Amino acid sequence: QILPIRFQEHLQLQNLGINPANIGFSTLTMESDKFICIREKVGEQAQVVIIDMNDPSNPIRRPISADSAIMNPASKVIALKAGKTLQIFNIEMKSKMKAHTMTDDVTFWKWISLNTVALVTDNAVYHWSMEGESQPVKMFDRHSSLAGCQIINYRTDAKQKWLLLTGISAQQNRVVGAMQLYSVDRKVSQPIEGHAASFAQFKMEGNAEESTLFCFAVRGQAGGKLHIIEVGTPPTGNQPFPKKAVDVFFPPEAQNDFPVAMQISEKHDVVFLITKYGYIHLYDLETGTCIYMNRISGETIFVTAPHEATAGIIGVNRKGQVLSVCVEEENIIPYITNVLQNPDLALRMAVRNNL
């Protein structure tokens, strides 16, 4: 009928020659929709395969000896690491911009801005700006509640005043999610059960200033839930953002499936939530009203990034299939109005988000 979301397949890494074996969390990265790095090993010559999303058919291969590679969100500047050794190269100008040696192994790192790399070690989190001659800065000490977890994600609000680290572990025969929410201003951490989340800016009607929101999904003991709350003291003169909560569904077949990704379109004010096993959920950022929900991938999804173009969400799955999902501006309203029979939400989305 009509869908309130458009789905699209942009690539099949396997048609590019990549080995399925390297299509996974620890060997294929996608820091942004502009590139995809895959570490393969032909003979004992490990090497990275960079894929320009604008030239899928021309992947450049280069010998590397890094245990991890992560291309910058906006340019052919790449971060490589080997143990405590970190180097950033400007591929195009064939040079090493910066280099640093950590006094701990980095368990997980990722770009969190056009110029800043976040480094996670077993017990602390650092931010490393490429701006000038800067060296890692410890942002905060890991909370004991993540001790032992496999770190899977780090996120930040816009002003980098709220940080969210996330790890997952097996407990009770179920994937449990552990998150640490740290406030740069009040120097305080907060343990939160959660699997996926993201931050978002939002100007409530009647508010002069925007509001910083923290939205997370969790499949806890009470099943699936999704919260949306305002983080920190509201801007002077502003107003609270009512905390919102709504469960996230999980059919009976998906018994040990859980949330693995979350992008938020500030363009439509919606929350895309993907589960490990191919489920896509649409939620209104404002009310938390679950707009849509179906299955976009039979293979598991391990990585995603904002699809800037559509204001949606892009991602790779275990088969090498690169797919996206965005709001189908042409019908989101009609769908909400008719199919969902939610006149209020629809009247609001249109007006609010000028659809």
Add this chain to the structure above:
Amino acid sequence: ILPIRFQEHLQLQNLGINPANIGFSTLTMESDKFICIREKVGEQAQVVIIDMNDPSNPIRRPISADSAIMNPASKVIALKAGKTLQIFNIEMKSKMKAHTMTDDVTFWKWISLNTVALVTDNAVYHWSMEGESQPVKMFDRHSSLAGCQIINYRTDAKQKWLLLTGISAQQNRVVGAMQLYSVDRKVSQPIEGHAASFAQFKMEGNAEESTLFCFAVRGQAGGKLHIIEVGTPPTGNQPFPKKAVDVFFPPEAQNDFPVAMQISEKHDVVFLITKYGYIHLYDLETGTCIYMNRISGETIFVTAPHEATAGIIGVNRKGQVLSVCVEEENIIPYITNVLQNPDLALRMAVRNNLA
């Protein structure tokens, strides 16, 4: 001081009402005597009635209605299931009257202690509970309210003038489509409007009263509020000079519009409330804006006259039940000193026998 008096009466949340059901289509308040919420508790639907004289003891009952509305003055409830309508006297556990429409009712509300207005896609009916009556088509729906979301239906005292209000998204704004019908002249008039109410007013030097029609709108001209006499002045009466003012919208409220109006014949004042919680106080006679301010940070979706005080009472998406009324103690001093409007002040005192 304040010309009005604010007051929280309840927090439906504290009563165990799911915030999901605290909206336009599931929570109804046809008077300040009761609030009905429709909840899906388990796989079975049910209505929760809250007796405003005894909030703490909400009574729950199994229903299968897609809509429920309490009589303004008694535990007599209208329940609808598609084209099927039933009226029950809860305390007598009896089915008073029943009726099966040919078309689905998209909106209905009590307009008197004994009449229920029904709105179908293309017509409006009245249904008295007096005797063995049935629904009586009052008039056909104007094409301008075609595709609109019906949100209100009001009558003057003598049920001679009828107002049906719809709203929709157009050019990225909420446009208000009203239909004003004359029972006597059998003629309908299209009017761009959001909220409005009727009122009886005896102009000085008139034996009989004037029947006023006040309505507020945020059209392209920005926001305005009109007060005009409707119909032909009673033989002998001078006519009531039409009034037109500006209703302010600050720059934060960009898509905010008028959502409810209640007029107090007691102080002859109009209480206007915007979608996103603003409150305006205009003099019914002159249309002089006497006060404005934020009263709810969460949007309001239903109000009713608040009898005890003659103010207005409503509910926001949060569940808070607020009410604003004239602060009899200082509405005069306020006008006089804060507004420095000695004339309006001296008038309102003498007019409505105050101080």
Add this chain to the structure above:
Amino acid sequence: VSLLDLD
């Protein structure tokens, strides 16, 4: 057809 269970 009772649209209301009341007992």
Add this chain to the structure above:
Amino acid sequence: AVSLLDLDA
């Protein structure tokens, strides 16, 4: 020292 990346050279 040694580079983690080799870009011809």
